[model samples]
Target: EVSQDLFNQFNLFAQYSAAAYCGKNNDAPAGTNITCTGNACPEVEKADATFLYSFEDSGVGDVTGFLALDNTNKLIVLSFRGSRSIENWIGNLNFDLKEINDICSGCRGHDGFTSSWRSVADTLRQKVEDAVREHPDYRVVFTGHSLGGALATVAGADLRGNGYDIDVFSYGAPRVGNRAFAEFLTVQTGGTLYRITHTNDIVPRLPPREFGYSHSSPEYWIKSGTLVPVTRNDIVKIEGIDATGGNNQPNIPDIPAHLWYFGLIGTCL
Candidate 1:
């Protein structure tokens, strides 16, 4: 189920993967548009946003992500790149779920969130801080796909703990932390966290719940299409358990489902 505002916001952020996965250099000057121009993200070319900062780190699973601002919405969007490299997959598989304690007073995070994800967020912490300082009135939304989605969760948790007003929207994101961390995340973000998953995306079901990994709740499960309907799909909503389903067959590779969102197409690699 999706709301008009949520659908539009998620659709817009999902396109950032165009900038994340494109062959464009991450070192492009900060002010450059860097709006995705490849076949991967045609819709982003018209987005009312500007690249404010770019980041890439080979040491940390070749982790990559960026920060941009959409003045039309007065939003400071922090976008993370998905798994397009061997190192990223490696990080994803390093599911040694642990506890996060570095960010704030009561807010803890998931250990399976991966060190590479942590490094990227920690490295960019200052840049994000400065951005928020520069635009004191702007609200922040952290978004990403796949591994990047996992990173967004951790980053959002950290920022929320640090006193920034924020929300999070992650697609195909795996469980980032345990119950305690999830509770902390919800409390800190003011319950604005939306962890979206497509049918059998496989990624979201990963790091395995048996191993103690878990996700934040109120997840919007999109079944049978990329476009989230304006009307709510209440039948699928669970009261105390995780919601289920997606637009694709459960047997097929979930990659395509991961890439297509609303009207936007994403190139993970």
Candidate 2:
């Protein structure tokens, strides 16, 4: 049963997912230049979240993200920025799967997404592990929009492989790996995954099943557009590869659909 508490929790994480895209339009590296103040990310700021660190790397995979402490919620929040640059477009077109068996037996993932996360994998682990350990009582979360979502999934799997606790909240995320990898990720995360699709979002169908790419289980599809009422009934909970169900409508590849997830998802940018 997808309880109301679970749904509300997902809603909060969705805001973090939107906030993830904030200030990512730039190409600046991680340093003092990045801050979460002055309308940078209102949802984050409103939460009394304090920025711990920000990271940007283009030399390898064009990844950008930040980590923060959600003081009120007792969460160590890690968020990734979505695709905005032409390089990201090209990278998205790179659909080959990279062997990542080290993360799991026979595990593989989208080459572009995997390489992006791997570029900062060690650094991400260090920050997350260190922060979570220090906080002790706080939970750790990974969130992102679009390509960022793909990276969060890979990153979560990378850390969760050790059986450590890590939960993911993804918005308009694309299919990031083969069927085997998808199933393995489900088990690895112990079902702590939420690949939320908005309206008729088209990203979730990307890289094509023809290329062997797949999405993880329990896909939460928002059935309404912005400002439209979406009761729990309107939120469809689809199981693994509901090929013809959920947001998998016939050829409705919507651009606006990708732009929304609890408000213009990248409004922070």
Candidate 3:
């Protein structure tokens, strides 16, 4: 129940906080544990070498009261991967406007190409809405790494479209819609979302051209930092998950914080 004007200011706060989180060493080692039920929630401390599970929000459906705080102090990205509840319908409505990647094979456009992605967006939106209702005085952020990041962008847009202000932080997320989509997103939400990328992940950048996948322009990708701005002009590479690297890669190259949450900037806003 927050007003549009207040949403704008909070959106700025969340974006700045996210940048700091990404720039700080705010994470803990894996296998960390946490226990949560209701009123007994305890925040994670960074100097204690723990993850700060800070982000929380909701969108629609039975996902009325949900949170995505970290279990350990890991630089976590709580993603709405796809639908996990009836609320996902709200996101699905937005996804319908875009086309799916042809490389995905057999996946239909948002309407026909059903996946957990839509559900994740919807549920996450519900979480944001819930948070806004509870505070009515704060800006909410949505984020994800890889596919999850893509979902986060869509969810942020959905919430923003509804007059709710939100800042979206995406890491290694490919361009979700085709050329002009970014402009649409900018127009729809006033351009508050920011996407981050390292060198070249590969998978997130493909499809729009060669494989029939649809997405924003290379300019849009660069704006998100996925194209390594200074490296090449017309030859941006696609984003890949680096499956061969397994799960123990170091933070030197700055693999998504999850692989090196303890080593990278300890936290991700």
Candidate 4:
């Protein structure tokens, strides 16, 4: 069964924990968050809540671990692979990546873009939508590493298109589609999408950024930091890998690099 109601339950649990709804330093009234010193912000927690996710057949290799975060310090993440694909917007019914690539390339054949990706986007969007309906007062976030990051971008875009305020922090995501698509995402989402890349992670630069294909630009890209062991929820300190290309752009803290890019979009909204 689809785990559409994951975040809702997580939000209620957070309230029980008295988790403060956070995003902006001045997000709530003064003294709402101990970290807030009347506009002077301090280091905030990674996420107050955690949403663990995994897709069907994720047991196979090349799995996509998807995650999303919300203002209530809530975080959502999932893993999906192999048989658990998604219905994409550009491809056939499901992730018919080959067909999507063909169409994306204007009938020309292309590799890397797979069919399962389509279904991945569709499923993720459905999940986020479900969260929005349930948690009406919380901010929404979407994140993933590698292929999961790509799907996160789509999920972020769909939510923004529906005017559901959301932010996406993706790590090591490759070019999802063409340039026009990326521009559309930036414009539609209003900088809602963020790309976190590590300097040596070459997987993200696939298909080439200049190909005019939809690619993660340095504007919102965040440099991947050293892999460190950090623990959250049941997950022990997972390795925190470097940005490889994290955000490809300069370390513009205010601009909201992929790692911390949520700040920029938050201020605008």
Candidate 5:
């Protein structure tokens, strides 16, 4: 795992990968900067890496995600896009917990999460397999924001279960599964998984805990500033569900806070 400072920088690139889906051109050429206007992550400058594959699935409720390469770091980055429709939000709110396949035995995750994942699992696996086959020396990392984040969680788990080592960092991701699933993911990735939350990003609080939903641990809570700072004061490391609250439930879902990360408004597209 990289230092928090480096991890923070990678987070920006991951947001850029997620933001790429906001553009009209789904396929970005290799080693080219992703061009996008308006609120679709305006802060992302030219990408220094190569864009390999862009995954779009309107059949499975408008899911968008991509795979890219950061050759400088020898990292293969995968990013999932957030909600683009009411159906996506419905997937977010579908709190019914169900047991997935062997990857998460004894861990019951949200049904909606499983459905969304299964919808694109085959295609994602094939793409990543091809990417990894070509870049065998690269380390794999996963990231996203909001619903994208949730999908990233599922992707990380699936990849890990299939015998791949991966690191995950997400922004404002809601609970993807129950306590068992949370614990399962935590142990599966060891200490490489990080769930990032802003001052009051409400999405993290949803699929509410009351419905047996829970998030993975070792949360890097961003207490102040739009971007995550390396300084100890700006970022707090919390274990387990302690991050679920600090300023009451109401302050936890700040929409503006959700849209902005690391001083960048990589707004939902």
Candidate 6:
């Protein structure tokens, strides 16, 4: 039951997240995400997904996102790319926790990540609202890998706070905030947030739990190499923060493990 559901729920979102990585180097014309002119086209192209917008900030964090409409699935997706300029982005990060009173009481997030979300928030909220109003039946989804996953967490949480039902699927995202922020993510998402983890992926362990960061609930743990066809048995569904499971397993943190969800992620073209 959990097996196919995990696959069904996450497989499509994974492709969209991979496509987000392409935003750093390539993008489709407005309303033309499916007609890939280069490596920018990803598995998402298989769907009747129309490109809507691209949100990028090269000067700040280089945070990139892709907004597309899935006519067939009735989904409005916004996927953020992992940091392409890792050194610069990380360099810019103060890596300190700050208050986000707008989210909830005592809700604190990485100051850098919180600000990163804000950089794209105002513009994205308007676009998402416009899209949602235009297609009342469509489900709104936010997804991404690695740092993009971090951005998606804040993005999805904020949208959900604004009364939009949002589903967030994030892969290899780091710990984004404090305990309050994590709890808010679990409850606000209406049980639809799947923080998928690949075994031994190092990104999720960044800033460390000792720094007061925690991940949200209901993690889908892919316990092996994902490119070689994942089985339901290979996936473990853990409730709440499974410190001893998922990335918490004592295996050495493998960087390559970060890019093998469903396929090789972080690849363009």
TM-score, one value per model: 0.82, 0.88, 0.45, 0.48, 0.84, 0.90
Once fitted onto the true fold, the runs of candidate 3 whose alpha carbons sit more than 4 angstroms away are: 1-66, 69-117, 120-123, 212-269
Q: Which ten residues in a row have the lowest lDDT in candidate 4?
A: 260-269
lDDT of 2 by residue, 30-103 (tens): 33223343243455556677667766654356787678778788988788878877777788987888898877
Best-matching candidate per TM-score: 6
Model 5 ranges off by over 4 Å: 1-7, 25-32, 38-47, 225-232, 242-252, 266-269
Tens-digit per-residue lDDT, 1-269, candidate 5: 23666555645654564574465425565555555566454434444555677666634666776677767667777887777667877776667888876667788877777778778888877777777788888878778877878888887887775556777877777788887888887777432777777677777887777777777777777677544543445566667643444311554256677766564544534
- Expressed as tens digits, the lDDT of each residue in 1-269 for candidate 3 is 23444333223222222322331222323333322222122233221222223222232321111133332322222333222234533443444434443223222333311244444455455645654565565445565444445666665655565655665665445456543445454444433665544443453443234433344322112222321222223222332322212111232333342212111221332
33 in model 4: Cα distance from truth in Å? 24
Ten-residue stretch with the least lDDT total in model 3: 257-266
Q: Residue 102 error for model 1, in Å? A: 3.5
Q: Candidate 6 at residue 131, lDDT?
A: 93
Residue 10's lDDT within candidate 4 is 24
**Candidate 1 residue pairs in backbone clash:** 98-111, 199-246, 223-246, 224-246, 224-247
- How far residue 39's Cα lies from its native spot in candidate 4, in Å, is 31
RMSD of 6: 2.5
Off by over 4 Å in 6: 23-26, 35-43, 86-88, 189-191
> What does candidate 1's lDDT look like per residue over 183-259, in tens digits?
66555644277776665566777766676755666667666554443234421333233333332223655556565
Clash tally, candidates in order = 5, 0, 40, 50, 7, 1
- RMSD values for the candidates in order, in angstroms, are 3.7, 3.1, 12.7, 14.3, 3.3, 2.5
Best by lDDT: 6
Tens-digit lDDT track for model 6 on 1-269? Answer: 25576686677887788887664323456777454334334546667788788656633566676788999788988888887776436733678889998877889998877887787688888888899899988899988888888888888877675656888889888888898888887777442788988888888887788788887887888886845756667778777753566786656788888878877777754
Model 2 segments more than 4 A misplaced: 24-43, 161-163, 189-191, 227-229
